[PDB]
Swiss-Prot record, chain A:
This is DNA-directed RNA polymerase subunit beta'. DNA-dependent RNA polymerase (RNAP) catalyzes the transcription of DNA into RNA using the four ribonucleoside triphosphates as substrates. Resistance to the antibiotics salinamide A, salinamide B, rifampicin, streptolydigin, CBR703, myxopyronin, and lipiarmycin can result from mutations in this protein. The chain holds residues 254 to 506 of 1407 of the full protein. The RNAP catalytic core consists of 2 alpha, 1 beta, 1 beta' and 1 omega subunit. When a sigma factor is associated with the core the holoenzyme is formed, which can initiate transcription. The rRNA transcription and antitermination complex (rrnTAC) consists of RNAP, NusA, NusB, NusE (rpsJ), NusG, SubB, ribosomal protein S4, DNA and precursor rRNA; S4 is more flexible than other subunits. Belongs to the RNA polymerase beta' chain family. Acetylated on several lysine residues in the presence of glucose.
Curated annotation (Swiss-Prot), chain B:
Co-administration of salinamide and rifampicin or salinamide and myxopyronin suppresses the emergence of resistance to both antibiotics. SUPFAM superfamilies: beta and beta-prime subunits of DNA dependent RNA-polymerase. This is DNA-directed RNA polymerase subunit beta. One of its GO terms (biological process) is bacterial-type flagellum-dependent cell motility. GO terms for cellular component: cytoplasm; cytosol; cytosolic DNA-directed RNA polymerase complex; membrane; transcription elongation factor complex. The RNAP catalytic core consists of 2 alpha, 1 beta, 1 beta' and 1 omega subunit. When a sigma factor is associated with the core the holoenzyme is formed, which can initiate transcription. The rRNA transcription and antitermination complex (rrnTAC) consists of RNAP, NusA, NusB, NusE (rpsJ), NusG, SubB, ribosomal protein S4, DNA and precursor rRNA; S4 is more flexible than other subunits. In pull-down experiments interacts with CedA. Acetylated on several lysine residues in the presence of glucose. Pfam families: RNA_pol_Rpb2_1, RNA_pol_Rpb2_2, RNA_pol_Rpb2_3, RNA_pol_Rpb2_45, RNA_pol_Rpb2_6, RNA_pol_Rpb2_7. CDD domains: RNA_pol_B_RPB2. DNA-dependent RNA polymerase (RNAP) catalyzes the transcription of DNA into RNA using the four ribonucleoside triphosphates as substrates.
From Swiss-Prot, chain C:
Signal peptide: none annotated. Belongs to the RNA polymerase beta' chain family. It comes from Escherichia coli (strain K12). Co-administration of salinamide and rifampicin or salinamide and myxopyronin suppresses the emergence of resistance to both antibiotics. This is DNA-directed RNA polymerase subunit beta'. The RNAP catalytic core consists of 2 alpha, 1 beta, 1 beta' and 1 omega subunit. When a sigma factor is associated with the core the holoenzyme is formed, which can initiate transcription. The rRNA transcription and antitermination complex (rrnTAC) consists of RNAP, NusA, NusB, NusE (rpsJ), NusG, SubB, ribosomal protein S4, DNA and precursor rRNA; S4 is more flexible than other subunits. DNA-dependent RNA polymerase (RNAP) catalyzes the transcription of DNA into RNA using the four ribonucleoside triphosphates as substrates. Resistance to the antibiotics salinamide A, salinamide B, rifampicin, streptolydigin, CBR703, myxopyronin, and lipiarmycin can result from mutations in this protein. Zn(2+) 1 binds at residues 19, 21, 34, 37.
UniProtKB/Swiss-Prot annotation, chain D:
The gene is rpoN. This is RNA polymerase sigma-54 factor. One of its GO terms (molecular function) is DNA-binding transcription activator activity. GO terms for cellular component: cytosolic DNA-directed RNA polymerase complex; protein-DNA complex. Belongs to the sigma-54 factor family. The chain holds residues 88 to 474 of 477 of the full protein. A motif (RPON box) lies at residues 349-357. Keywords: Arginine metabolism, DNA-binding, DNA-directed RNA polymerase, Nucleotidyltransferase, Sigma factor, Transcription, Transcription regulation, Transferase. Sigma factors are initiation factors that promote the attachment of RNA polymerase to specific initiation sites and are then released. This sigma factor is responsible for the expression of enzymes involved in arginine catabolism. The open complex (sigma-54 and core RNA polymerase) serves as the receptor for the receipt of the melting signal from the remotely bound activator protein GlnG(NtrC). Residues 261-280 bind DNA.
């Protein structure tokens, strides 16, 4: 769609239109009994149009559009680094996630992280709705929606109740080994930056000069138990590449 | 002798080498190029003249009529720069061209002048450049970046030994024009020359020669040396040239006069050649075997039969020699070949040549250019004539011709833009010579082979590109009759030129939004060189050797300032003194050295010229008469450096900062930093944000004033005078009569810029730095722009810092900040934002901006005025209404329910819907400005009327000021003349001006002079009335908008942001970090006087990074602050001016033979007291980049302030009162606030909108998108073994729709369990695969 | 258009339970094929899975 | 010279479009009123039958939030014979309290009562407003205030407070959910006054970049190039003829448009009537009076006693002008209108005047006092 309530055709539609036009012209010529030197030319052009539709540029030369660039065929949709397999089926964007700048917290314990409470309020919203309806504060879903919108004084107590023993996953990119994702218990803080335990930075290859991290929420009971038993930072003191410790002091310590 | 703006506060300089050449104007590269583009030219070498004369005259096919060009002109712009920026239009001027049409009669000799008609025609608009080298396109400032491309000419290259598996090197030679096609000559692995055009199919080399009027005999004559055969009736007694025998072994008995100098089986040596040359050996007896395989030169035919014996390019044989012996042939010609030299390549290619004559070669060329197309003679010959030899289709330019001739060693620089036979022949000969080891290949990264192209040249090229289309249209139109009334006005169209110019200026690769964080960002952007763009390289297929520091970059391109990442090495910065040739090659200045005496003559040398000399360094010590000191000096010559004697030197560098850019020249103690950290600091320095107050560095390099003044952000006095009026928003200067033009009131009015948005949505704000009644000179600073302090660049703040570890809060580049820093708003910034509401017109009626919105409460409409526009000064948050607008819903069927609704709730609520403008969610601020634009014909509202009243008052103010000055002068003259007639002194003084107007005198010339003066007074009044009327007319004029658009309203909001944990801070030495904590003031370390520190930095970041400049800067900042503290202590307990000036003179006299001389005896006591008041927060210091301050001088300055010489003091713990066990380094450092605020980084999401095809969450913060969970995160989860977490990621959180809804319902229900399904993207994949005719399906 | 690349007779309705001409609407006509326009009365998501 | 704009909205983009490859368009999802309603339906403790009834009910809600079919239609659409109508009524009552309150109402009285049922009992004039809405809601529509006062047995002040409370409610609760953004139209031909006469010119917002790909096929596109030229030529000619024939509509507004038909323009421009009907449809012109579709200038006619013809749009404008200035104490019936237009030479009927009044959406004479 464009401005003014008008639409522009995409690449697949263009290729389909070209194929249909060639097919109609060939059918009309064949029914009209034209000389062979013309029906053969139409047949060749129809073959070229179909070949362009199926795989554009593989044979001959790629047909371009208004932007002097080749059109996208079906094979282009299927394959490549921008195809379905690698862009949608092997990795994808997800809900219940955020990101922010990381700072240092020297007071934390090895199983703890520091999470801003605005991020936590946004990430744990259906849990807050459920807890609000459970204890009679809200009778309907819309009442809880309004209460969370207003940020009343009781929703912060609810938020402290829901995050009490619920782990979160912290991830820093690029993920080079499996220690690029780790599970922590959140401690609600003010400010807008995520606090990170000093002893794990070496595992993340992270430093506090502008790095950012993403945070994900596990939902079901199996995911929470997997976070507590497989991915928590207290289970990852030894490297998997060799047998040496990775959570080790450095620099100031 | 210091200027007024410099005498207020003088920066103490530690440099020791005198300056012989001042820093040039830093924006010359843009202004010169556009001035070349726009100015009139007597010849047609540059600009619009060269483009016009490249196309015109344009004549029809029949020759009956011709269109010709005479002159062009540019009118005055409609609006000013500020008006264009405010309104949102393009600052440009109209182009007028005087064309003429001539008619030629038929049946007449040549062209008879039946009629010539000349007319001026409108060609379009041309954007103009402002005083600071920028363009205002659609109201936003833009920069066009210069490009570093390959020069035209001829270039010889070779493959490095890769194109073949044998390791043999293959050479090639390319011809590169400005316009036209490419011509490549290349060697084959079989030593066969080949010719390629436009990278097309490889063709035999001799096809080009045969296309030209050339024959095989002529070819062999050109490319080979002859050998003469005389058969003197005895074994073909041969003539020999001794040097031809080198590298060969005798194959027979070589004798002269019966002595065999070289016998069979003996190799020919140099001494044998000496013997032959001494004896003049000519007659050589050789057998037939010596002529068994030699190639015949020309064609020979028997005189008896007359038939052809042997064709050209034929190797002889015994039978052929026997046949030609009886044919009466005594003189024969052969070719000469060897291996070390004179190798056979043309003959073998002729052997491979399939063509025979010119027509065959042209047909072959036509087949190559056009595949399968049946060619003829005419098409082929026309195509080959037009390919390289037509002025309209092939241009080599003037620089291309110069380089072409200089490569082939020709004495002429001038020439034509087309090729010829001689040029191609010479190129082939040069390639052959290089093949035979008699030449050298080029270096395509040498800065003598790379040219700079600026804005004017690009604009000229685009204008010519448009002119060709206009010419085609004219030629198509001119081929008819009806000429008895035609005029050139109906002959050309503005669109084909104006469209091209607009496209180039607004949507090119090298046209970019100006970087506007601070003045340094703008200066750096305007001096940038790019290797990308049209006609340049690409980020991926560029190479590895083009991203490297070539030795010829010395003094022309900064080796330190380049963007790290993908574009490293492809984006460069200019050096401080670098210029360009008249051809576009960078050159740099040097001082000529003659007779061992370094003089003051400056010569600008380019990379080609520089390599032939011996050039000394700027570190070299000189005597007072210019002579050197040591018999050995360090010099550069032929790309290397070594020691040379005092007499072998030719030149010398002008400065020690000649090799760096502007950004790198602002880093103090650069020579003590590693290059990586210097690069990082130079990049970081230009993304700092201006704060509420400026703060001069207090440790600088002396380059701050140049950057402050040459950036254009300040207000600079155009003429000298006195400050007649000073105010927070305007300045009025009373000009000296020595500079006033005749017949004017001498006043200059400067209107300062107050709280204006920049491209990065920050504040631009000017403040006066002068006071009422003080004198100013030309070029002094009157107002300070953003990040400027009394005319110096001030990007950050001076912080008191300590280096020590503090409980893990500065672990891994974290920063601990005091609460007193926050309390004083030292790093607080202002951010401004613009929003717009457009009242349009649609099919169902016009939209209306009004305050009567049908279904909103009285509280929501509380801040809207009577016109539905928010008040100035209102505080707004998310969801508040800024402009109230309604849109017509249309008409319905009018069922009884709708009629009942109309009856009850009113008819307005049934006709319109609410479509107002609201503050975006999560945005606050204060409304500081509203601008309303109304289309003509429509009526103005109250808001627009008030705005127009304000603007009219503002204009009337200046008009009244000038009129008042002129009226006062005229009245003074009138009264002076009136007294001379005999009028009373007191009576005239008490008589008012109206009474001065009406008075009588005698019948002398006094009455006539008074009448003349009164008439002049009336004329002055009329003139100023006319000026005011015109200004009012322009102010109150209606506006022309886009079709349909009726009204436009713009609202500006302003907010203040404070420092907080997560914000990024940096210094000038590559030391960046993030704030981790804000500490209460009584927890900070304090010294013995109870003074706390502002910032604590980790000392473990210094030794591994090797940026030692920050430690020295800290020490010197401590010393400067100590000097300032002594001055402040003297000032507080009021002491005599003598003591103040004595101490300040002692402070300025410090140092080991510095070049700065400050004398306080020529200062008045007022000046001394003002200077002391400006130095009471610390004395600023300058240390040049490679001519800075030593440790001894820093220690002396520490001793002057009664401070420890080691720079380390005793600190105490604020929480316990206990002394730290070791001394700590405490000082002052210049910190910056970078534009990486955590307010713009934090983002979170639970559920939102999804894509339509993939049904997956969108991306980005501005779309409330999700985080990507790519392949590597999947691998990590697989390595852990968390299968359920991965299944949650893949299905119920991204694109399983029913699973999404059921998971949300279960979570709200208190049941944490999922029921996964199939992702939608897999179904899409199945459909896409089945659209390819492949049956893929699930089963069982 | 009819018999085009976006035909509603072939690929389904453009709105939930509404045919193209507008004679049949709402959930009580589900599965009905309108005779005037030839469009089925069903969900509009079948345009994602009909070839 | 073409007029250059003296003001404009600076373009939203602030980037350098450096990337040479960008993905294909996909679009986003939107939340309409029914999406929000279904989202609330799912999170409510219904049953299977209740959820099916709720789905069928939400299917019938329109853009304004009003139910569009009777409950019998929903009960039939369920398709199960055990279900009665009271269950449907209960599910509808539960749905009507979703956000926004009053949505899915049968008629205005029901919506107003639903909204009033939510206010706390301590609101002062609650019972009076409830009585007014429940019993006598059309006497308020007639702005009577005296017969309503004679029936409600109340003083003036209580009635005024009740009316103010009633008019503070929301008659269209479902318009709060704004998923739409106001779309506009782009005029194709612009009409401006040159030398005192109106002349037309094509809009320069189109794409006139005539280019070919000679690097490598374009023969078919060469025909489209001139097809575009033919389209521009026919549009320009038809619009020029329309403006030339209607020189007086722009100068003096309506009441002066001529009664033209497709055949006149077809004869003028030498093209078939079908081509004229095709060009002048969904194509607009911009004038200092507004944006008008080209079809707007074709109209019917009625006989004029003077011997000419009067366009129907002129008669509609005259009816509007006469009714706008009628007697406030006693308005004008169409019998009066046909008399006033008779003396001017316009020979129209009475039912035709009534039809014109209906098309203008003007209440009858008795309702205009
Ligand atoms: Mg980092
Ligand atoms: Zn239908």
């Amino acid at each position: 769609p464009l401005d003014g309530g008008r639409f522009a055709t995409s690449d697949l539609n263009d290729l389909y239109r070209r194929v249909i036009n060639r097919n109609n012209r060939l059918k009309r010529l064949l029914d009209l009994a034209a000389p062979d030197i013309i029906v053969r030319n139409e047949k060749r052009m129809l073959q070229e149009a179909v070949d362009a539709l199926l795989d554009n540029g593989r044979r001959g030369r790629a047909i371009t559009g208004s932007n002097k660039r080749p059109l996208k065929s079906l094979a282009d949709m299927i394959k490549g680094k921008q195809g379905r397999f690698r862009q949608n089926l092997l990795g994808k964007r997800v809900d219940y996630s955020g990101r922010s700048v990381i700072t240092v917290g020297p007071y934390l314990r090895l199983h703890q992280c520091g999470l801003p409470k605005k991020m936590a309020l946004e990430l744990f919203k259906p849990f807050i709705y459920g807890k609000l309806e459970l204890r009679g504060l809200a009778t309907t879903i819309k009442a809880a929606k309004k209460m969370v919108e207003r940020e009343e004084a009781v929703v912060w107590d609810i938020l402290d109740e829901v995050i009490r023993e619920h782990p979160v996953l912290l991830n820093r990119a690029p993920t080079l080994h499996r220690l690029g994702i780790q599970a922590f218990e959140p401690v609600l803080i003010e400010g807008k930056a995520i606090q990170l335990h000093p002893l794990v930075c070496a595992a993340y290859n992270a430093d506090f000069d502008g790095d950012q991290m993403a945070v994900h929420v596990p939902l079901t009971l199996e995911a929470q138990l997997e976070a507590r038993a497989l991915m928590m930072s207290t289970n990852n003191i030894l490297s998997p590449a060799n047998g040496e410790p990775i959570i080790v002091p450095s620099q100031d310590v | 002798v210091y200027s007024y703006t410099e005498k207020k506060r003088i920066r103490k300089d530690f440099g020791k080498r005198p300056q012989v050449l001042d820093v040039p104007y830093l924006l010359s590269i843009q202004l010169d190029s556009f001035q070349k583009f726009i100015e009139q030219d007597p010849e047609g070498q540059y600009g619009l003249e060269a483009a016009f004369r490249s196309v015109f005259p344009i004549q029809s096919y029949s020759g009956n009529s011709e269109l010709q060009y005479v002159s062009y002109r540019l009118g005055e712009p409609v609006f000013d720069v500020q008006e264009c920026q405010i309104r949102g239009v393009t600052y440009s001027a109209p182009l007028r061209v005087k064309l003429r049409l001539v008619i030629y009669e038929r049946e007449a000799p040549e062209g008879t002048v039946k009629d010539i008609k000349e007319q001026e025609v409108y060609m379009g608009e041309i954007p103009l450049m402002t005083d600071n080298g920028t363009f205002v396109i659609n109201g936003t400032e833009r920069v066009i970046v210069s490009q570093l491309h390959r020069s035209p000419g001829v270039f010889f290259d070779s493959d490095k030994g890769k194109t073949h598996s044998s390791g043999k090197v293959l050479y090639n030679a390319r011809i590169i024009p400005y316009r036209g096609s490419w011509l490549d000559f290349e060697f084959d692995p079989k030593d066969n020359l080949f010719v390629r055009i436009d990278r097309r199919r490889k063709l035999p080399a001799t096809i080009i020669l045969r296309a030209l009027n050339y024959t095989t005999e002529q070819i062999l004559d050109l490319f080979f040396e002859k050998v003469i055969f005389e058969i003197r009736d005895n074994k073909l007694q041969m003539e020999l040239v001794p040097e031809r025998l080198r590298g060969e072994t005798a194959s027979f008995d070589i004798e002269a006069n019966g002595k065999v100098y070289v016998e069979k089986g003996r190799r020919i040596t140099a001494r044998h050649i000496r013997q032959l040359e001494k004896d003049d050996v000519k007659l050589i007896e050789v057998p037939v075997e010596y002529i068994a395989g030699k190639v015949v030169a020309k064609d020979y035919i028997d005189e008896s039969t007359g038939e052809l014996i042997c064709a050209a390019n034929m190797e002889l044989s015994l039978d052929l020699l026997a046949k030609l012996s009886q044919s009466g042939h005594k003189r024969i010609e052969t070719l000469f070949t060897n291996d070390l030299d004179h190798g056979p390549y043309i003959s073998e290619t002729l052997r491979v040549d399939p063509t025979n004559d010119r027509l065959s070669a042209l047909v072959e060329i036509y087949r190559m250019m056009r595949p399968g197309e049946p060619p003829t003679r005419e098409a082929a010959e026309s195509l080959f004539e037009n390919l390289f030899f037509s002025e309209d289709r092939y241009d080599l330019s003037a620089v291309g011709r110069m380089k072409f001739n200089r490569s082939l060693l020709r004495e002429e620089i001038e020439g034509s833009g087309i090729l010829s036979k001689d040029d191609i022949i010479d190129v082939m000969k040069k390639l052959i010579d290089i093949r035979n080891g008699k030449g050298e290949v080029d270096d395509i990264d040498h800065l003598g082979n790379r040219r700079i192209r600026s804005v004017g040249e690009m604009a000229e090229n685009q204008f010519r590109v448009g002119l060709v289309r206009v010419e085609r249209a004219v030629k198509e139109r001119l081929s008819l009759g009806d000429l008895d009334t035609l005029m050139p006005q109906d002959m050309i169209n503005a669109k084909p030129i104006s469209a091209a110019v607009k496209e180039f200026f607004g949507s090119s690769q090298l046209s970019q939004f100006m970087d506007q964080n601070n003045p340094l960002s703008e200066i750096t952007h305007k001096r940038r060189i790019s290797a990308l763009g049209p006609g340049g390289l690409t980020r991926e297929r560029a190479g590895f050797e083009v991203r490297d520091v070539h030795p010829t970059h010395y003094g022309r391109v900064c080796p330190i300032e380049t963007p790290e990442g993908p574009n490293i090495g492809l984006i460069n910065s200019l050096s401080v003194y670098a210029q360009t040739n008249e051809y576009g090659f960078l050159e740099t200045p040097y001082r000529k050295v003659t007779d061992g005496v370094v003089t003051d003559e400056i010569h600008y040398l380019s990379a080609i010229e520089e390599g032939n000399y011996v050039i000394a360094q700027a570190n070299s010590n000189l005597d007072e008469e210019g002579h050197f000191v040591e018999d050995l000096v360090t010099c550069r010559s032929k790309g290397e450096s070594s020691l040379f004697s005092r007499d072998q030197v030719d030149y010398m560098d002008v400065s020690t900062q000649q090799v760096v850019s502007v950004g790198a020249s602002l880093i103090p103690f650069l020579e003590h930093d590693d290059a990586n950290r210097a690069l990082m600091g130079a990049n970081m320095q230009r993304q700092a944000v201006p704060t509420l107050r400026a703060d001069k560095p207090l440790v600088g390099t002396g380059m701050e004033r140049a950057v402050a003044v040459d950036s254009g952000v300040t207000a600079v006095a155009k003429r000298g005078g006195v400050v007649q009026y000073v105010d927070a928003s305007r300045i009025v200067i009373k000009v000296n009569e020595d500079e006033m033009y005749p017949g004017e009131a001498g006043i200059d009015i400067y209107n300062l810029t107050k709280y204006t948005r920049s491209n990065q949505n920050t504040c631009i704000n000017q403040m006066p730095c002068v006071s009422l009644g003080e004198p100013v000179e030309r070029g002094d600073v009157l107002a300070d722009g953003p990040s400027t302090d009394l005319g110096e660049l001030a990007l950050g703040q001076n912080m008191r810092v300590a280096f020590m570890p503090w409980n893990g809060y500065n672990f891994e580049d974290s920063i601990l900040v005091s609460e007193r820093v926050v309390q004083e708003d030292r790093f607080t910034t202002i951010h401004i934002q613009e929003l717009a509401c457009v009242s349009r017109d649609t099919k169902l009626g016009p939209e209306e901006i009004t305050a009567d919105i049908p279904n909103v409460g009285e509280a929501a409409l509380s801040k809207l005025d009577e016109s539905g526009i928010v008040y100035i000064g209102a505080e707004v948050t998310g969801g508040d209404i800024l402009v109230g607008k309604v849109t017509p819903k249309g008409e319905t069927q009018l069922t009884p329910e709708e009629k009942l609704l109309r009856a009850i709730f009113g008819e307005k609520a049934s006709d319109v819907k609410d479509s107002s403008l609201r503050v975006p969610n999560g945005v606050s601020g204060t409304v500081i400005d509203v601008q309303v634009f109304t289309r003509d014909g429509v009526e103005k509202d109250k808001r627009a009327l008030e705005i127009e009243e304000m603007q009219l008052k503002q204009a009337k103010k200046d008009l009244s000021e000038e009129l008042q000055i002129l009226e006062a002068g005229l009245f003074s003259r009138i009264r002076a003349v009136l007294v001379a007639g005999g009028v009373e002194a007191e009576k005239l003084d008490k008589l008012p001006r109206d009474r001065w107007l009406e008075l009588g005198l005698t019948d002398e010339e006094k009455q006539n002079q008074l009448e003349q003066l009164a008439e002049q007074y009336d004329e002055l009044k009329h003139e100023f009335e006319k000026k005011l009327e015109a200004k009012r007319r322009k102010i109150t004029q209606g506006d022309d908008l886009a079709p349909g658009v009726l009204k436009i309203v713009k609202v500006y909001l302003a907010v203040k942001r404070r420092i907080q944990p997560g914000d990024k801070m940096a210094g000038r030495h590559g030391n960046k970090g993030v704030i981790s904590k804000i500490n209460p003031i009584e927890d900070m370390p304090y010294d013995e006087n109870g003074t706390p520190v502002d910032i604590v930095l980790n000392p473990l970041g210094v030794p591994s990074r090797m940026n030692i400049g920050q430690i020295l800067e800290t020490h010197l900042g401590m010393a400067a602050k100590g000097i300032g503290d002594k001055i402040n202590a003297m000032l507080k307990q009021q002491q005599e001016v003598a003591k103040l000036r004595e101490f300040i003179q002692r402070a300025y006299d410090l140092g080991a033979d510095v070049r700065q001389k400050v004398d306080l005896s020529t200062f008045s006591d007022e000046e001394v007291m003002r200077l002391a008041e400006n130095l009471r927060k610390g004395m600023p210091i300058a240390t040049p980049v490679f001519d800075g301050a030593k440790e001894a001088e820093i220690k002396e300055l520490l001793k002057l302030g009664d401070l420890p010489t080691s720079g380390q003091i005793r600190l105490y713990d604020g929480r316990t009162g206990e002394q730290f066990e070791r001394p700590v380094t405490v000082g002052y450092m210049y910190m910056l606030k970078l534009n990486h605020l955590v307010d713009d980084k934090m983002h979170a999401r639970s559920t939102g909108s999804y894509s339509l095809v993939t049904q997956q969450p969108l991306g980005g913060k501005a779309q409330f998108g999700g985080q990507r969970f790519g392949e590597m995160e999947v691998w990590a989860l697989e390595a852990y073994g968390a299968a359920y977490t991965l299944q949650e990621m893949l299905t119920v959180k991204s694109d399983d729709v029913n699973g999404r809804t059921k998971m949300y319902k279960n979570i709200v229900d208190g049941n944490h369990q999922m029921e996964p399904g199939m992702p939608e993207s897999f179904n899409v994949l199945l459909k896409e695969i089945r659209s390819l005719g492949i049956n893929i399906e699930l089963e069982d | 258009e009819r018999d085009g690349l976006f035909c509603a007779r072939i690929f389904g309705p453009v709105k939930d339970y509404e045919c193209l001409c507008g004679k049949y609407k709402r959930l009580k006509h589900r599965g009905v094929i309108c005779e005037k326009c030839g469009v089925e009365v069903t969900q509009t998501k079948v345009r994602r899975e009909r070839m | 010279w073409d007029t250059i704009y003296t003001a404009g909205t600076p373009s939203g983009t602030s980037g350098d479009y450096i990337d040479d490859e960008l993905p294909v368009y996909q679009g986003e999802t939107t939340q309409t009123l029914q999406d929000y309603l279904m989202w609330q339906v799912e999170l409510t403790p219904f049953s299977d039958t209740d959820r099916a009834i709720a789905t069928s009910i939400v299917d019938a809600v329109d853009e304004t939030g009003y139910l569009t079919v009777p409950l019998e239609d929903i009960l039939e659409s369920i398709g199960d014979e055990e279900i009665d109508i009271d269950e449907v009524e209960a599910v509808l009552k539960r749905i009507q309290r979703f956000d926004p309150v009053g949505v899915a109402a049968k008629d205005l009285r029901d919506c107003l009562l639903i909204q009033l049922s939510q206010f706390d009992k301590t609101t002062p004039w609650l019972e009076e407003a409830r009585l007014i809405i429940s019993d006598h809601l059309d006497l308020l529509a007639n702005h009577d205030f005296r017969t309503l006062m004679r029936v409600t047995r109340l003083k003036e002040d209580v009635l005024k407070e009740a009316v103010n409370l009633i008019q503070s409610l929301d008659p269209r609760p479902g318009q709060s959910i704004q998923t739409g953004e106001p779309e506009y139209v782009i005029p194709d031909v612009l009409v401006r006054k040159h030398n005192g006469h109106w002349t037309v010119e094509l809009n320069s917002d189109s794409i006139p970049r005539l280019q070919i790909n000679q690097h490598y096929n374009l023969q078919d596109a060469k025909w489209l190039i001139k097809s575009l030229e033919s389209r521009n030529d026919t549009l320009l000619r038809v619009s020029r003829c329309i403006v030339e024939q209607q020189q007086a509509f722009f100068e003096q507004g309506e009441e002066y448009m001529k009664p033209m038909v497709l055949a006149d323009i077809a004869q003028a421009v030498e093209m078939h009537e079908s081509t004229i009907s095709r060009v002048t449809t969904q194509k607009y012109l911009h004038s200092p009076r507004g944006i008008f579709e080209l079809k707007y200038f074709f109209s019917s006619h009625v006989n004029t006693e003077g011997g000419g013809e009067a366009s129907s749009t002129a008669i509609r404008a005259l009816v509007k002008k006469l009714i706008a200035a009628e007697n406030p104490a006693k308005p004008l019936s169409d019998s009066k209108l046909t008399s006033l237009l008779s003396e001017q030479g316009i020979m129209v009927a009475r039912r035709t005047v009534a039809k014109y009044r209906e098309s203008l959406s003007i209440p009858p004479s008795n309702q205009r006092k």
